[PDB]
Each structure stands twice: as structure tokens, then as C-alpha cells.
Write a protein that binds this ligand. Sequence first.
Ligand SMILES: FC(F)c1ncn2c1Cn1ncnc1-c1cc(Br)ccc1-2
Ligand SMILES: FC(F)c1ncn2c1Cn1ncnc1-c1cc(Br)ccc1-2
Ligand SMILES: FC(F)c1ncn2c1Cn1ncnc1-c1cc(Br)ccc1-2
Ligand SMILES: FC(F)c1ncn2c1Cn1ncnc1-c1cc(Br)ccc1-2
Ligand SMILES: FC(F)c1ncn2c1Cn1ncnc1-c1cc(Br)ccc1-2
Ligand SMILES: *[C@@H]1O[C@H](CO)[C@@H](O)[C@H](O)[C@H]1NC(C)=O
Ligand SMILES: *[C@@H]1O[C@H](CO)[C@@H](O)[C@H](O)[C@H]1NC(C)=O
Ligand SMILES: *[C@@H]1O[C@H](CO)[C@@H](O)[C@H](O)[C@H]1NC(C)=O
Ligand SMILES: *[C@@H]1O[C@H](CO)[C@@H](O)[C@H](O)[C@H]1NC(C)=O
Ligand SMILES: *[C@@H]1O[C@H](CO)[C@@H](O)[C@H](O)[C@H]1NC(C)=O
Lengths: 336, 336, 336, 336, 336
Amino acid sequence: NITIFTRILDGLLDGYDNRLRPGLGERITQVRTDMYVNSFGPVSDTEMEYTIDIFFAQTWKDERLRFKGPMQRLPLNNLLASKIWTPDTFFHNGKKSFAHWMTTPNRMLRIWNDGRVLYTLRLTISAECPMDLEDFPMDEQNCPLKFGSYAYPNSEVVYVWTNGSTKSVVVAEDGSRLNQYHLMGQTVGTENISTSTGEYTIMTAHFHLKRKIGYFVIQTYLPCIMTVILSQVSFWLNRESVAARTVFGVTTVLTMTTLSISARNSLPKVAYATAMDWFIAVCYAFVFSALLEFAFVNYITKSQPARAAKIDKMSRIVFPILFGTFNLVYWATYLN
Amino acid sequence: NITIFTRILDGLLDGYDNRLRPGLGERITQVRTDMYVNSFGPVSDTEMEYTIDIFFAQTWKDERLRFKGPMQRLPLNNLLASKIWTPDTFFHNGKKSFAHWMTTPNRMLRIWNDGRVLYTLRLTISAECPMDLEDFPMDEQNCPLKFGSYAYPNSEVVYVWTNGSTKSVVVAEDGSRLNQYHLMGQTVGTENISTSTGEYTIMTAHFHLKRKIGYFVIQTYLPCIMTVILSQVSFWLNRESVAARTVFGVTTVLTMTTLSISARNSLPKVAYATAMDWFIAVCYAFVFSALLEFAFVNYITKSQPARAAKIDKMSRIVFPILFGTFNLVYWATYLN
Amino acid sequence: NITIFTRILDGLLDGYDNRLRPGLGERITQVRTDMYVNSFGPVSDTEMEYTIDIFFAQTWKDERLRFKGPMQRLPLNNLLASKIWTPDTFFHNGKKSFAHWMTTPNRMLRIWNDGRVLYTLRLTISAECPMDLEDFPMDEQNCPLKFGSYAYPNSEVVYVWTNGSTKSVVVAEDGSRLNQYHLMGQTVGTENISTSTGEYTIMTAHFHLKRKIGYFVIQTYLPCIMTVILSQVSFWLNRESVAARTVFGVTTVLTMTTLSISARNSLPKVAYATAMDWFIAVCYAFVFSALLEFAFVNYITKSQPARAAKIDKMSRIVFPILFGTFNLVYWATYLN
Amino acid sequence: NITIFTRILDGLLDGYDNRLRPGLGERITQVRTDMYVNSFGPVSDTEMEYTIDIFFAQTWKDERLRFKGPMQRLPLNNLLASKIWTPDTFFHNGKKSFAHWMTTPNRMLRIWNDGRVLYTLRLTISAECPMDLEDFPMDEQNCPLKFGSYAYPNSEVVYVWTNGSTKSVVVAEDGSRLNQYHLMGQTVGTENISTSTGEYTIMTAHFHLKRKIGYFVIQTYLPCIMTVILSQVSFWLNRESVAARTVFGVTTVLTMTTLSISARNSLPKVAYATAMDWFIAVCYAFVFSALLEFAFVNYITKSQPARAAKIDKMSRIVFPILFGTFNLVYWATYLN
Amino acid sequence: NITIFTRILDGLLDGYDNRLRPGLGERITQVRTDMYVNSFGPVSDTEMEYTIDIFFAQTWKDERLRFKGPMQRLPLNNLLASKIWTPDTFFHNGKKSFAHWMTTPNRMLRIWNDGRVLYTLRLTISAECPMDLEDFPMDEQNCPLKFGSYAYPNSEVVYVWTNGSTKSVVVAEDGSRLNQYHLMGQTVGTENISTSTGEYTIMTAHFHLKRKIGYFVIQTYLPCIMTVILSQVSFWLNRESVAARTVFGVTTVLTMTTLSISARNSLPKVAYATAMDWFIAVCYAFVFSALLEFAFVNYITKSQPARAAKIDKMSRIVFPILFGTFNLVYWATYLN
Ligand SMILES: FC(F)c1ncn2c1Cn1ncnc1-c1cc(Br)ccc1-2
Ligand SMILES: FC(F)c1ncn2c1Cn1ncnc1-c1cc(Br)ccc1-2
Ligand SMILES: FC(F)c1ncn2c1Cn1ncnc1-c1cc(Br)ccc1-2
Ligand SMILES: FC(F)c1ncn2c1Cn1ncnc1-c1cc(Br)ccc1-2
Ligand SMILES: FC(F)c1ncn2c1Cn1ncnc1-c1cc(Br)ccc1-2
Ligand SMILES: *[C@@H]1O[C@H](CO)[C@@H](O)[C@H](O)[C@H]1NC(C)=O
Ligand SMILES: *[C@@H]1O[C@H](CO)[C@@H](O)[C@H](O)[C@H]1NC(C)=O
Ligand SMILES: *[C@@H]1O[C@H](CO)[C@@H](O)[C@H](O)[C@H]1NC(C)=O
Ligand SMILES: *[C@@H]1O[C@H](CO)[C@@H](O)[C@H](O)[C@H]1NC(C)=O
Ligand SMILES: *[C@@H]1O[C@H](CO)[C@@H](O)[C@H](O)[C@H]1NC(C)=O
């Protein structure tokens, strides 16, 4: 009772032209698409790209595949996929996507007696995410995903999300395993682009990414915060100890500088100032300013000692407060 | 006496449809799988992936291949593999797996007169291992491996480990050659997932990894441990030696900071604090606190010298004990 | 009403030799080309290459494809592309270009009843950009793109930009997403090369790149500028403070040196001096010269103290002015 | 007189089944193998792998290819290689091997009238070398190479080195161009493995690698050796010079630490101590101990100056001798 | 008038055996080769390899392709290339070469009525260049390129440069765009190798590379040269300034050491001393020796002050001269 399926299958491929879309010159082909994100790959900030794995699925109606038999469905594999017509779907925003040919080309094809078809596939896409690091690291990146027909304009093939925009895109609970980002939600949209080769429908999906702070705090902020405190210890030393206070300010300033250099190594070479850079600059001012106060004090301690002591004692209560006050404004502004 | 085999082989492929699973619409195909891990590839903590090489094997019953002849077995190669039906097995947790086509596509196919089949294959899989580095480096990672049918639901194709769960998975003695991990054992499990395309059976194998400490001790802990001791030498110096004690504390603190920066370079950019980070912070407190004691002592040595000497002498017996006491609690807690 | 298209398509491929160009031995084939840059990939200064993605398009007239039917156009896909003749276009300046085979080979083929053809394609090209970093970072790189026939000389196949040189090349608004470069415009040109295998027409497109400064200012210039100021603080200290002033000059000089080493790490290993290098050298002279002044002052303070004070006080008003004056000339010269 | 060869060639392929080994069910196929190492690729200690290029050659007897003609040999190329049966040879120890398809698939096939065959091939193998870095850098690594049949057990196909074990493996004089290793010789062995799929013969070749020291001496040992000497200069300074001697010991100790961190960067992350690590630790003790002596001396110079001078003067003659004595034992032990 | 070409083409392929070389068993096939280097890729000193792009061309006589028609030449493309016989040329010195399949496989095939053939091709070769860095950076590397037949010995196929050895190899003016090397010229040679599979002719081409100094001067020499001068400033300071002179020598020595470590990072891990290493060692001696002089002076200033001043004053005129004298000998020796 297996040879019956072979006879049914052969009839479908008899005279089936895979170079022609269904309903050619009779109507507009309608494609219903759903996606399941197996795992959201790492996001490369330097390259402005994010890898992703998805079980991309498509559905369309083809009368040429109509058949009648005891079985209402015909599970198949990639062997018959190339023997029929499939949409020339491509990712406009993608850069380099490679398929999975292990163990067998990962493609499932299902056909119903009514002629409805389902051609799912597994993909790995190194899409590009243009990020505006103006509020880095307190930023909410919106990395989009776009795909559509490469040869069939909007007047022939139309892509529409299936079962609404709610269950069209699904993300696995463990799939979202980013180290420096925290996925919040997904949105799906549609648009038309009027290129030189006619209008083309575009299916757009956006993933809302909220960067999870804590790595930079342990890596950049705390060394800078503790670096500033180290300089302020100099104000608790005798003025005549020129050598002692010199080491604090001099060593602290250089240590402040190298942190800025090291911090941007991981960060992309953006041609503007981020929020972290402003914080570093402010920390640089405190340590640098403390050195100026010591230099100024030593320049007048031999002429007006009375004012020299007042400034040094006052600095012990001014600089810590300003740095503390600045942090509250900085953190509150960017955490609200 | 070789042409007889050719005639037998030709009959099997005569009318054999490779697009249809055996026992279609008559029963549920049963697949028995066994694995042999030739070598457990390196584990990339940064990318949360682990390479592995396996001689993946599969077995199933197909009556269409029944034959009678003098030989009870028909060893073959990849040439005939594509001429018949094979399961569309795929690794759900895999990211990028490439086959070995050297010297010849590494595939062995064996057939018995009863119709039983054996289709073994050699694979290299860059699977993903989600790790929770909360107790790093004292962690017991459990990197799983998952695979199953891509097109045939649980109602048609079922995967089961052969000869129980003991000898189903085998690891070579020299295959486990990890540098920073020590494999302890393996476990195999089965589960069903109810996706939008029906239920699918999943074969899950977990490898218990116990990180072997000793690289971080020579790389991070000892420099930190010796860094703390260097600061404590300052307490064995005259109070008036402001410049001498300043270099110890100031240089030590910065050296402590850079170790934290360098240590996390190899570690993944995790947005939380690991056990090692807490140890570094404690070491930072000792060196930083010693500097505060020196600064405080110098602030009062001109007013109450009597108490200044007591604190300095006391510090020689307090700080070493606290650091030593902390280590025992830290090591004992994370080594138990 | 679909079988009619199949009959029309079959007639075109009946006796169509894809090894022979249209109009062989009768005229010269004319090819009209247009380009759309989906995204200008990153520019690797170290490797002198720039990635780019384009929807390269070609057009030519072929009488062998003439047909008459109800439909004036025949949208198709890659399936029929290999069945006909296409130009052997190649990128002379390219190094490694790979096509996009996801989801389906991204190729659109359109045919009109008149015989006109359109064979568009999506490409990713790692072209090479020879850059002259004499005025780095104030440079205007002109990265060209070249392509032409590999087998058909200028006497048989000619490439010409379509619809003039204005709309021939189009760049997406969001496609130009470079981090350290700011695209200004594009130019297209044509030329002939007389190789040993006859004359070949070459289509050349140049992209005008204006480097966007701001990353190096925050990375190299400012640390150098602030490094110089740190040394000048020494002039505001007592002459007898040999140890204090020694740390400033000595530490500053070494910090100046390492910045030069670190700065060139990202920069390509060019065997000549860039504008930034000259700026670093000048900054090195100021810090180094300040150390010499301190050494010279200490060498005479025991013999002629009167002149020692004058030089130290004078230096407080000379070095800052010269460094400030130099910057205006340096920035004005390279920003004009 | 060329058409005669075509007729002879056609007869051989007439009825030749490439899915069946020669002498099936009549005897055991015997394969003679010889190798020529064109170049021993770089050895990646971090990845425990070594690239290699070889003109792997195989020989076997096939009566189905017997022919009679004027020419006793039939040089051919890869075109006919796929039309006949070839062994399913694979490298058990290999990880990722890719063939050379430039300019043409590099395969030479030769056939004699007697039926003897020769199927040579060019390969690039990224084999894995498990190294025991217990005596690093004074180690003699033995990187093996293993290959055998993937589908044919020992009872059907047997691999044997040709013309003995002397000329079976040949290495080019200029092929061995390793930077940090010095090849000494090669050994070839055979063994049987009783897997779950029957016995399989294995051809094993071992390359004796003797690491050539001199890079680490200029990179690690000498900086450590000179670093120790720098500290010992402190003993030639006045005791009251607390600041001067402090810089020597303090700066030296930190410089000693960073060398250990930098040294292991190139070295694999091995979870144990190497010989170099012990040498570094000993050097650390000398510099660290010298600091303790200075601290201890300053702690008693105000109470018992007489003994303070004796220790300082004695240290000038003790520490240099112990460090010198240690080196002779260390170098002699690991160089014998 | 196009169908005539098709008929002529069909006749050539009628009975044309592509597995047999022309003139089999009648004469020795002669192949004339010419090369055009489009661009000399980067030279990786670490991997001892150099990328290169070439329009490799071959020519040979085949009587089987003789034809008579109005056109004396038959331009073609890769479509017909696989239908005929081509030499099995391979690069003996190559490691990994990949062809260019964009937009179409870059292959031009031309045939004349006389039977002469021309099969040009575009290649990218990652050849290996064994370099002897004994005089680094003043070295004249000679990177060779070798190729020949893989299956046809010298008795059947012979490779000879066309039109002499002058115009056989051509390099584009802009193709030579190396950053740290300056190409001077090219040489072409021929040789025979008597392997186990008969004699094989080898075509060898050598490219004379003259390293262009200037990157290392700005990167290594100048920091070392200026580092030495910094130490010599100490001799212009009062002897009793123990702390001041200590910082110069101590800081300078460590800075000298790190430059050696950093310099060799780019350089390959060669197990011997280069010219630059000797220069660094000499610079190390000057800075290290200056420290010894200061230590020795301070050891006797309390016993024989008269000689202490003489040595310090003398050192101001000795060390600068010796370092200056050494440079002239060093530069003159390696620049002649
Ligand atoms: F005219 C050619 F450049 C061309 N070749 C393919 N396309 C185009 C037009 N074009 N311009 C930008 N993006 C496109 C586009 C978008 C979709 Br969706 C499908 C096909 C194309
Ligand atoms: F519905 C589509 F998205 C789809 N295409 C393939 N699959 C699915 C369902 N799906 N969702 C997550 N994982 C799967 C899955 C699991 C196995 Br095992 C086999 C096939 C699929
Ligand atoms: F004579 C051979 F070396 C050769 N083989 C292909 N070409 C050449 C001539 N050549 N030299 C440099 N660049 C070329 C060139 C340019 C175009 Br456009 C198309 C083909 C070629
Ligand atoms: F039983 C399966 F796992 C299996 N599939 C292929 N092989 C095996 C047995 N096996 N286990 C480890 N190594 C092997 C081996 C060795 C040679 Br040589 C040839 C084939 C195999
Ligand atoms: F005998 C086998 F090892 C073998 N297989 C291919 N070759 C050889 C001989 N061999 N040894 C080193 N280099 C070669 C060589 C050189 C040329 Br040119 C062409 C073919 C070969
Ligand atoms: C795109 O085109 C379709 C068909 O004309 C239309 O229904 C839809 O509204 C268009 N979408 C937009 C955003 O204009
Ligand atoms: C999976 O499905 C099979 C068949 O229904 C069943 O026997 C098995 O118990 C199921 N497994 C689980 C974990 O539910
Ligand atoms: C290239 O050749 C064509 C045809 O001869 C000619 O029309 C054109 O002017 C030439 N271009 C140049 C730059 O010489
Ligand atoms: C391997 O098997 C063969 C055939 O039985 C035998 O001759 C040979 O001695 C065996 N080798 C070893 C090492 O046992
Ligand atoms: C190589 O062999 C050919 C043919 O025998 C001969 O003419 C030529 O001189 C040989 N070359 C060398 C270098 O011996």
C-alpha cells in the first residue's frame, strides 16, 4: 500500500513547470509566513551585525498539486523540494546567510489534497543592525529583519504574516541567550518599496533589545570611580609632602587615561562621544583638577600659608561631594 | 562470483522510492541510534559553544531492501547512500556542522538479508552550551546535545537509544582532551516537544563537565594574593617614610585594578559578578584599606603620635589574619 | 492558461546555444548596466579593502529570445538563467566575491517580446582600495570599483552605463553606514585597456570617502594634548623638588611613547610618517624639552641661581603658547 | 592511433561496478600506501593541531581493469577516478581536511595491464596533536597521524606500508619549516582496533618533534633573569635611602608578575605548572625576598644597626650566588 | 549566420575524449605559459605566506580541434572548458588556492583553425614563502612560485615560458601595493625533479622583495633611541639625588624591556636573534650600564668623593659618544 503514494506523487510532477508561479496571469499569489527563532545569536557591536537561527516557514496555494487519496497529507523532504516551484525569498538586510545541510538538508515539505503547501526551512543569518550609540550603554537597540521576493513584484507575489501579528513570530525561551543584551519583545510590520523594477512588498520584524548593564560597571565605571577616590586621598596629606602627593595625582591621571583607551577597544570606532565617554571625562577632571590644586597650593605655600591650608582642608569636603552629586544626576538621567 | 552481488543490488533499487519512509501508512518507523565521540572539541566559553566529533550511527528496518543470497551482509559506501531513503536527522541545539568529505565522504552503509539497515556517519558539530557562570571557576557545566527528525513527527518516526542507555553513547579515552575542563560522565534522555507542526521526539545527551582549576590560580589568584602581601609590607616601615609607603599602596592598588581588567578578557562578557570577581574585590579592599590606614595615620601623627604607632603595629597582625581567614572560607565554601 | 507560457518558453530554448553571444559575427553586443548599492560594507584600512553589497543589473538585446504572446514580460528565476547565454562579467579590482544563495539563488531574469533581456543579481564584493595615508586622518580616499568582460574583447562586447551617468549608480540612504568614513558622492567612468588578449572595455565607479574625525581625537590627540599639559605643571614647582619634577617629566615621556605605539596598532603598517605622527613627535618634543629644562636648571642652580629662576618662570609662559600656537597651524592647515 | 586507447578504456568501464571492492567474497583486498610530506604546516599549540600537506598515494590490485595493448601504462586524471572503485580512506585523528581543486582536482590515476592501480592524491590535514607540556619548553612532542578504512573492516581491506617502513614515508628537505619546532625523524606503525563494527586496521605515523629553544629565552627567561639582577642592585645602596630601594623592589616585583601573565598568553591554558612557571616563581622569590630583606633591615636599623649592615653586605654575595647556582641546576636538569 | 558556428563546434566535441592528452603515444605535448600578476597580495610574515592574484594563461596544440570556417577564432567561456582536455596544472609551493566564480567562472577559452588553444584563468594563491630573518629588517626576501603537472611526467607534458623569459611574467604597476615590502624585479626558471613517479618539469618564478624600512624606525628604533637618551640625562644630576636618578634608570630599563616584548609580537616566533634584537640589547646595555654607574658612584661617594665626581662628569661625554658611534656602524653595516 506504498506504491499508491508513488503513483499520486508522479502525477503531480507530470507537466509541473517549476519556472512558473502558481496562478500565473490569473491572480496574485499569496504567501503566508511564520517564524520561530530557535536561538538569537550573538550581537557583534563592532560589525553592527547579529546572528540568528530560525525555522522560517512559508505557505501558499497551488492547484497544480491537487490530488485525491486515502491520506490527507504528504510529508516529504528536500528531495522533492527542487522539483517544484518555490518563492525566491531573500533577506534584504542580510549580509551572509548559509543553510544547514546536516545531517540532511533541513527542509520539510507538506502537501494537502486541497493543494495547500508548506515549505519550512532552517536558516542562519548574519544580519546587520545599525545602532545609534548616543546613549551607550543605556540604549534600546531595535535590530530589524527584512525579507521579500527578489524577482516577483508586489503585483504577483504578496507576503503576509499568518494568524495575525501575534503568533506569527515566536522566540524560544532559551533561544534568547545574549550576554550583554536583554530581549524585551518583537514587532512585525509590512511595507512597500517602489524600486526601479516595480513595487516589492517587504516583511519587517523588529526585536527590541535592552542592553543589560553590569559588565561595564565592573569593567569601566568602578575602576574610574575608585580611581577618582585614590586622588582625593592626597588632600589628607601634609602640604610639604611634595613627592607623596605627586605620585597620587600623576599616577592617577595616567591610569585614568589608559582606561579610556582600553574601554573603547571593545566599543565600535564611533566618531562621536558616548555617555560613558562624558563620565570618563568628568572623572578625568576631578583627578586632573586635584593635581592642579596641589600644584597651586605648593606655589603659594611659601608666600601665603594661611590660605594654602584652607584650600587643602576645603578640598577634602568639596571634591567628594561634587563627584557624588554628579553620579546621582548621571545615573538618574540615563536610568529614567 | 561478483556479478551476483550487482544483480541483487539492482533489484533493491528497482522501484525503490527514496522520498517515502519505510512502512508508510502501515506503522511507525523506529530508529535505533548509537554514538561514539571520537574527540570532544574545545569549549569556547566566549561563544558558549563546544566542538565535538562523533561517529553518529542509525539503524532501522526496511522491508523493501529484503534479499536472499550467499552473503548475509552488504558493506557499501556513500555511493549508494543517496539512492535510498534516510532519516532527515538534524541537531536542534547545533549551530554550524560540516561533514567530512576526505578522502571519500565518510559514510558506511550496511544491509542484512532481513532488511535491517545501518547508516553511520562522521560529524563535526559546533553546538552551543548555555553556561551559568555564577560560581565561576568552581562550576559544573552540563552541555547538552539534541537531535531529531526535521520533517517526520513523533507519530511517524521515533528515535530510541539502542541497547539501553549505558552503551548507547561512548567516549574515547583520549578523545576527552580539554584543557580547562574535566569530563566526568554522560547522560542520555528523551522528550517530546509539541510544536506547531505536531509532536517531535528529541534525543538529548548531556555531558557533565567539571572545570579543572589551576590555570586561574597561576593567572589571577596568585598575582592577587601576592599583590595583597606587597601592600602589607608597608606596615613594617617607619611612619615618617611618607614617600616609601605611598609607592607600595599606590602602585599596589593600580596593579590590583589591571588584573581585574585583564582577567575578564578571557572570561565572557557576563552581566553579573562571579566568585572570582568577589575575591578580587576583597583583595582590592585590603590593599585599598591599607592605604587609608597610612593616610589616616599620617593625618594624626602630628597631633596624637601615641595612637598612631598602636594602629600601625596592630595592622601588622590584623590584615594578614583577615586575608588568611577569608581565603579559608572562600576556598572551603566553593570547594565543597 | 498557464500551459501557453510553457510552450512559449520551450520554443526559446529549442536550439538556443548558450556558448555563443547574441549577434555573433554580425554586430557588437551592447550591454547596459545599472547598480544599486544596498549597503557599503566596512572599510578595512589594514587590508586596504572595502566590502560592498549591490544589486548589479545588466541589459542586452537578443533576437533569439523573440516571442509573441498575451504577456509582454516573462518574470523568471535562476532556474532558466543557466539555460541561456550571459556575459562573463568579472571585477578586475575584486579579491574575493561570493554570491547569495539564500533562500534561493538571488537572480531575477526578465524577457520582453522584443528580445530585450534583464539579468540582475545580488553580490558581495571584498574589493581592494589603495589608500595614500599621507594626510591621515585628514584624507579623502577614492575607492574605485572596476568590472568588465573576461573573455569578450571590446570589439565584441561593450559595457555602457544606462540612462546616463546620473541614475546609473544609486546608493541607499541607510546603506552608507560606515563608522570612520563619511561618503560624499559617486562618479562613474569608462576606459579601454590594451592587454595581450586585445582591447577590453572597463566600467569604473569611484566612491568619494571623507574620513570623519572624532574617534582619533578622543583616542590619540586628547591623551597627547593632556599629556603635554601634565608636564608643564612641573614648571609651577620649586626647583629643589628634584624628585617631584622628575616623576612628571619621566612618567610623561614614557606615557607619550606608548601612545605612539598603541595608535599605530589600528593604523596599517605604512612605511612613512603620517600627519598624526608629526603631531605626536611635536608633543614628544614639548614633554621631552621640559625635562631637559629641569635637568639644565638643576645643573646650574648651585652656581647661578639668578638665571635658574628666570628660565623656570619664563617656561611657564613660553611652552604653553608654543603648543597652543602649533595646534592652530596644524589644525588649520589640515582642516582647509 | 589515439582511438585505440578510447576503445580499451571503454571496455574497462563496461559493467564495472564502483560500489563493490575488488575480489569481493573471494579474498581480502590488500592496499599498499606511501606518503610524501610536501610541507609540515605550522603547529598550533593553543589548538593542539598541526597542519600538513602530503601527496598521499595508494596501490591495489583489480583484475576487472585488466587489458592488453601497446602501452603498458595509462596515465589519467580525476575525470576517470569517480568512475571506478576507490578505498574509503579517512583520517581518524584528523579534524578538518580539505582537498586541492586548483587548477584541476589534484588526482593522478595510473593503470597497468596486469590490473595494478595507483591513486595518488594531495591533501591538507589539520590533525590534532595531544601534547603533554610538563617539561615545556624542553619537550619532545610526538604528533601522530592515523588513517584507515571507514566502511571496510580488517577482514576485507588491509592497509600496509609499501617497500618496508623505511621509504614508505618521505619528508621534503624544505618541507619541514617550523618556527618553534625541529623535526628529528618519523616512525610508522600498524595496529588493529576492535570497534562495535568489527576490527579495523590502522596505519599510524609518528613525527618526532624537538622544540627549538631560543624564542622563549629572548622573550621570557632573559627579561626574568635581568629583572632579578635589577633588584639585587638595591643591596649596593645606603640603608637610609628608603625611597630609592623601595622603587627597585616594588617596581621589580610588579614587572616580574606581568611577565608571567604575558608569557602564558601564547602558551595553552594548561591546568598545571610547567618548567618555565617554576623558573618564574623562583625568580619571583629572589626579587620578593630582596624586598623583605630591605623591609626587615629598615625595621631594625633603629635598634641594632650593627646587624643591619652585616645582612645588607652579606646579601650582596648570597643572592647572586643562589640565583646563579639555581640556573645551572635548572638548565642542566632540563638540557640532559 | 550563427547556426554555422554551432555545427562547427559540435563536430569538434564529436568523439573528443577529454581523458586523453593530445598527441598521445605520438609525441610530447608542449605547453606555453604566460602570467600577469593583477595584484601581489599581502605578505604574512607570521605564516610565511604571500597572497597573489594572477591571470594565469596556457597554450598548447591540439589537432583534434582543427576546423575550417569564415572565422579564424572561436571565443568561448567556461561552458565548453570542461568538455575538452586541459592540463592538470598544480602549484607545488601553494597551500590553499581558490578560484573566482563571480559573476561567472572566470575562464576564457580561444581556439584557432590550426588547432592551437588558449585556456586562461584567474587565480588567488596563498603560497608559502620561506624567509631567513637573519638580517631583519634589512633583508631581501626571494619568494618563489612553483607549478607543474600533477599526473603527466616530463616525458609527456613539458611547460615552457612563452616568448622568452622577459615578457612571460608581467606585474601590474598598481598591483604591487605591499605596505612593508618593495618589489624590485622578477625571475623565471625551469627545473626537473626525479620523484618516485618519474621526472616532472617545474616552472619556477621568483619575486625579489626588498623590505622598505620606516615602520620599525617609528615603532621600535626611535623609542629605543630616545629611551637611551632619557637615562643619560641622569648623569646631569647631583649625585646625592638618589631618588631622582633611581627613577630614570629603573623606569628606563623596564621600558626598554617591554619594547623588546612588544616588538617581537608582530615578528614571527623565530628561534634565533635578528639584527634588531642585537640593537635592542645594545640599547639595553647603555641604560642598564648607566644604572650600574649610579649605583657604583653612590657606593663610593661616602669614601672617595673625588673619583665619584670624575666618573659622573666623564660619563656625560662617554656614553653619548659610544651610542652614537655604535649606530653609525650598525646602520652602515646593514645599509651597505
Ligand atoms: F534594479 C535592480 F537594481 C534590482 N535587482 C533586484 N532588485 C532591484 C531593485 N532594487 N533596488 C534595491 N532593492 C531592490 C530590490 C528589492 C527587492 Br524586494 C527585490 C529585487 C530588487
Ligand atoms: F513550524 C516551523 F516553524 C517548523 N519548521 C520546522 N520545525 C518547525 C516547528 N518547530 N519550532 C521549533 N522547532 C521546531 C521543529 C522541531 C523539529 Br524536532 C522538527 C521540525 C521543526
Ligand atoms: F592574457 C591573459 F593574461 C589574460 N587572461 C585574461 N585576461 C588577460 C589579459 N589581462 N592582463 C591583465 N588583465 C587582463 C584581462 C582583462 C580583462 Br577586462 C579580461 C581578460 C583579461
Ligand atoms: F559504530 C559506529 F560508531 C562507527 N561508525 C564508523 N566507525 C564506527 C566504529 N568506531 N568507533 C570508533 N571508531 C570507529 C570506526 C573506526 C574505523 Br577505522 C572505521 C569506522 C568506524
Ligand atoms: F608519488 C606520490 F607521492 C606522488 N603523487 C603525486 N606526485 C608524487 C611524487 N611527488 N613527490 C613529491 N612531489 C611529487 C609530485 C610532483 C609533481 Br610536479 C607531480 C606529482 C607528484
Ligand atoms: C502595499 O501594496 C498593497 C497592494 O496595493 C496595498 O494593499 C498595501 O496597502 C500597500 N502597503 C502600503 C504600506 O502602502
Ligand atoms: C513521547 O511520545 C511517545 C508516544 O506517544 C510516548 O510513548 C512517550 O512516553 C512520550 N514521552 C514523553 C516524555 O511524554
Ligand atoms: C574605447 O573603444 C571604443 C571603441 O573603439 C571607443 O569608442 C572609445 O572612445 C574608447 N575609449 C577610450 C577611452 O579610448
Ligand atoms: C591485525 O590483524 C591481522 C589479521 O588478523 C594480523 O595479521 C595482525 O597481526 C594484527 N595486528 C595486531 C597488532 O594484532
Ligand atoms: C629537463 O628535461 C628536459 C628533457 O629531458 C631537458 O631538455 C632539460 O635540459 C632538463 N632540465 C634540467 C635542468 O636538467
